[PDB]
């Protein structure tokens, strides 16, 4: 399953 | 910015077999940008309803898909499939040989 | 043996033509298991092997929610990445990245992913480490400082190292008919005249699975630069195709062998034309 990711470039 | 040509194959699933139902499939690989149209020929003309893969890529960061259809080869009909990129000043047409 | 778990995410910018596309799809080894297409629908991520299926609503949920997100973030990434490029508005801009792991035979974690592209180039990986960052740029290097700031890298590896593995270890075991098993290559060699003086021999590898695997020698020396390998290719049935072809002059056939290496074999093949 995937994760999430909430940092932005 | 830096751009690849695709590779491209044209190819059976299975050994052709005259009268006998198969897949006709184009992979092109190995290019950049991902825009890339596609078409597959029968006696120089468009085969309607081919299917793709959903875009990926490889470790190198170059794109590839698989374009595919039902057919049934005979002596007589030529296949093709059509390719155009951005690096290609002209679409690449490459012809189907079932002894590659 | 070893195994892997990937998921591919392509974002591609079309200005004037509404959002961008994203695509995702997500791998074991070398079998597709989910996909997603922004373009689609009302889009959700969706199954593409059966060994997945089982896998309940709120798996579903969770992987579009998360599939969603990321398209939008990519969105807002793609805009600032002109900014750190110097770039105009009015060109497609491609953003791409991988992330998964790398297992052994008794399923611990051997390599852990995070890495990025911009337009076809690296931009920021995540360390074999899981604990710094490789900066292509000085571009990338200012996204080095955010996540340097906001110890992205921990949160990264806390999930490569264990729901990654976890989760690969479960679709292995739920897999198990497919993912556990090596199709050998079927082989043969086809002749094909060129003229009456010389004729092409073709080393055929058919219905294999997974995609790792071809040489010609002459006298037992390996033909390397007179040999035309194809890239290893889709059949469109899970199993992959491969040939290896050489030019021999006319009565010569018997001087060449094909060498064929894939984890399906006990043992390399070796094989001749055989009229």
Same mark, same amino acid.
């Given at each position: 399953?995937?994760?999430?990711?909430?940092?932005?470039? | 910015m830096?751009?690849?040509?695709?590779?491209?194959?044209?190819?059976?699933?299975?050994?052709?077999?005259?009268?006998? $139902?198969?897949?006709?499939?184009?992979?092109? $690989?190995?290019?950049?940008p991902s825009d890339?149209?596609?078409?597959?020929?029968?006696?120089?003309?468009?085969?309607?309803?081919?299917?793709? #893969?959903?875009? #990926?890529?490889?470790?190198?960061? $170059?794109?590839?898909?698989?374009?595919?259809?039902?057919?049934?080869?005979?002596?007589?009909?030529?296949?093709?499939?059509?390719?155009?990129?951005?690096?290609? #000043?002209?679409?690449?047409?490459?012809?189907?040989?079932?002894?590659? | 043996?070893?195994?892997?778990?990937?998921?591919?995410?392509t974002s591609v910018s079309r200005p004037g033509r509404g959002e961008p596309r994203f695509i995702?799809?997500?791998?074991?080894?070398?079998?597709?298991?989910? %996909?997603?297409?922004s373009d689609?629908?009302?889009?959700? *991520?969706?199954?593409?092997?059966?060994? =997945?299926?089982?896998?309940?609503?709120?798996?579903?949920?969770? !992987?579009?929610? =998360?599939?969603?997100?990321?398209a939008q973030?990519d969105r807002e990434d793609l805009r600032t990445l002109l900014?750190?490029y110097?770039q105009s508005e009015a060109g497609s801009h491609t953003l791409q990245?991988?992330?998964?792991?790398?297992?052994?035979?008794?399923?611990?974690?051997?390599?852990?992913?995070?890495?990025?592209?911009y337009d076809?180039?690296?931009?920021?990986?995540?360390? *074999?480490? +899981?604990?710094?960052?490789?900066?292509?740029?000085?571009?990338?290097?200012?996204?080095?400082?955010?996540?340097?700031?906001?110890?992205?890298?921990?949160?990264?590896?806390?999930? +490569?190292?264990? !729901?990654?593995?976890?989760? @690969? %270890?479960?679709?292995?075991?739920?897999?198990?008919?497919?993912?556990? %098993?090596?199709?050998?290559?079927?082989?043969?060699?086809?002749?094909?005249?060129?003229?009456?003086?010389?004729?092409?021999?073709?080393?055929?590898? @058919?219905?294999?699975?997974?995609? *790792? =695997?071809?040489?010609?020698?002459?006298?037992?020396?390996?033909?390397?630069?007179?040999?035309?390998?194809? !890239?290893?290719?889709?059949?469109?049935?899970?199993?992959?195709?491969?040939?290896?072809?050489?030019?021999?002059?006319?009565?010569? *056939?018997?001087?060449?062998?094909?060498?064929?290496?894939?984890?399906?074999?006990?043992?390399?093949?070796?094989?001749?034309?055989?009229?």
């Amino acid at each position: 399953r995937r994760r999430w990711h909430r940092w932005r470039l | 910015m830096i751009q690849r040509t695709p590779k491209i194959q044209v190819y059976s699933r299975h050994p052709a077999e005259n009268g006998k $139902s198969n897949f006709l499939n184009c992979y092109v $690989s190995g290019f950049h940008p991902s825009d890339i149209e596609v078409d597959l020929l029968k006696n120089g003309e468009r085969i309607e309803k081919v299917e793709h #893969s959903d875009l #990926s890529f490889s470790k190198d960061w $170059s794109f590839y898909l698989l374009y595919y259809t039902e057919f049934t080869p005979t002596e007589k009909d030529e296949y093709a499939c059509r390719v155009n990129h951005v690096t290609l #000043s002209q679409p690449k047409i490459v012809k189907w040989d079932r002894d590659m | 043996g070893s195994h892997s778990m990937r998921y591919f995410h392509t974002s591609v910018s079309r200005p004037g033509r509404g959002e961008p596309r994203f695509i995702t799809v997500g791998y074991v080894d070398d079998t597709l298991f989910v %996909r997603f297409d922004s373009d689609a629908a009302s889009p959700r *991520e969706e199954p593409r092997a059966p060994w =997945i299926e089982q896998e309940g609503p709120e798996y579903w949920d969770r !992987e579009t929610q =998360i599939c969603k997100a990321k398209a939008q973030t990519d969105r807002e990434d793609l805009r600032t990445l002109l900014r750190y490029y110097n770039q105009s508005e009015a060109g497609s801009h491609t953003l791409q990245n991988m992330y998964g792991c790398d297992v052994g035979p008794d399923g611990r974690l051997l390599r852990g992913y995070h890495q990025h592209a911009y337009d076809g180039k690296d931009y920021i990986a995540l360390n *074999e480490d +899981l604990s710094s960052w490789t900066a292509a740029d000085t571009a990338a290097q200012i996204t080095q400082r955010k996540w340097e700031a906001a110890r992205v890298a921990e949160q990264l590896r806390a999930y +490569l190292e264990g !729901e990654c593995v976890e989760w @690969l %270890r479960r679709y292995l075991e739920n897999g198990k008919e497919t993912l556990q %098993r090596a199709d050998p290559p079927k082989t043969h060699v086809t002749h094909h005249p060129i003229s009456d003086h010389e004729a092409t021999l073709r080393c055929w590898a @058919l219905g294999f699975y997974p995609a *790792e =695997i071809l040489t010609w020698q002459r006298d037992g020396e390996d033909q390397t630069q007179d040999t035309e390998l194809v !890239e290893t290719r889709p059949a469109g049935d899970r199993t992959f195709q491969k040939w290896a072809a050489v030019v021999v002059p006319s009565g010569e *056939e018997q001087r060449y062998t094909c060498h064929v290496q894939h984890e399906g074999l006990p043992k390399p093949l070796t094989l001749r034309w055989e009229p």
